[PDB]
Design a protein around this ligand. Structure first.
Ligand SMILES: CC(=O)NCCCCCCNC(C)=O
Length: 112
């Protein structure tokens, strides 16, 4: 695969930070697709029409599917939005999403 553009090399760095040990205490719920059968979330796919998670963002980045930084960011925000949408606002996983999202939004805004 071709080299990523400058902006996307920075985005790849954000992705690797979001998957790193540093943020694992709150990032782990986003590592893989929500397994609705395994978790018995019978209504998950009724409510969330476009699932997203970090392994999928990685698959897409490694496959050069993002045309620009905005495309990457849309997927990342979709991942957080799905979490806020599906779950009750007081669930632990919502607080974990928000902690991770604080990291994302700060790193993304400082993109050179
Ligand atoms: C996923 C897990 O292994 N344990 C319990 C956490 C449930 C989280 C609800 C579904 N996940 C998201 C990201 O909305």
């Amino acid at each position: 695969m071709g080299k990523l553009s400058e902006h996307l090399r920075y985005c790849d760095s954000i992705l690797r930070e979001m998957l790193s040990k540093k943020h694992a205490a709150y990032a782990w719920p986003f590592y893989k697709p929500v397994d609705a059968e395994a978790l018995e979330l019978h209504d998950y796919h009724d409510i969330i029409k476009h699932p997203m998670d970090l392994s999928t963002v990685k698959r897409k980045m490694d496959g050069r599917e993002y045309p620009d930084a905005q495309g990457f960011a849309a997927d990342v925000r979709l991942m957080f939005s799905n979490c806020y949408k599906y779950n009750p606002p007081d669930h632990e996983v919502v607080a974990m999403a928000r902690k991770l999202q604080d990291v994302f939004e700060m790193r993304f805004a400082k993109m050179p």
